[PDB]
Amino acid sequence: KVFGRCELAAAMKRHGLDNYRGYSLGNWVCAAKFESNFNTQATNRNTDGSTDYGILQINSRWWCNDGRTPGSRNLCNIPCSALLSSDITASVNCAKKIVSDGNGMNAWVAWRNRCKGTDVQAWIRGCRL
Ligand code: NA
Numbered sequence: 001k002v003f004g005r006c007e008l009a010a011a012m013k014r015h016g017l018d019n020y021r022g023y024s025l026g027n028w029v030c031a032a033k034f035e036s037n038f039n040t041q042a043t044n045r046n047t048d049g050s051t052d053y054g055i056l057q058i059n060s061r062w063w064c065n066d067g068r069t070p071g072s073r074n075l076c077n078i079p080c081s082a083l084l085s086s087d088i089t090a091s092v093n094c095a096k097k098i099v100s101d102g103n104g105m106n107a108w109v110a111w112r113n114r115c116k117g118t119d120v121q122a123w124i125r126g127c128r129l
Contacts, residue, residue: 001086003038003055005029006127008088013129015092021099025129026120027111028095032056033123034110040086054083056091056108063094 003011009029012018018025035057036042044052050061050069060069064080076094083091098107105111 001040003032003040005033005038005123006129008032008038008055009124009127010129011088012092015089017092017095020096021104023099023105024120026123027105027115029123030115030118030120031105031108031111034114035108040088040091041084043084051080053080054085054091055088056083056095057110058083058091058094058098063098 009025012028013025017028020028032038032055036055038055040055042054042057044057046052046059048061048070050059050072051066052059053064058064058076058080060066060072060080062073063076064078064083065072065074066080076097078090078094083094099105105116
């Protein structure tokens with residue numbers, strides 16, 4: 001499933017991401033746009049053998065287990081397959097853990113690259129939230 005920005009915004013708001021750890025809803029929607037292009041099924045292979053999974057491209061070397069990544073941790077204590085659901089619950093739960101013990105949303109390179117410091121509210125304008 002590929003989310004439209006407004007449908008995703010509503011889902012992220014439902015799961016409590018609006019202002020989670022101080023980051024407005026727009027930041028989370030923007031992150032998803034440039035990380036996975038709002039695609040819940042997207043995956044990306046990396047040079048270290050890890051793979052990024054889902055709507056928020058969560059990495060298997062640190063956050064989830066796919067059993068094929070050398071030197072992993074699984075800090076979100078979840079199989080990476082759960083991060084490929086049409087429902088974003090699992091990804092949100094892991095994202096909350098990632099932003100809480102880390103360097104804010106800088107954990108998402110695409111957010112740092114394309115969202116940080118910009119008019120992220122543009123991602124929720126025109127929406128019925
Ligand atoms: Na892992």
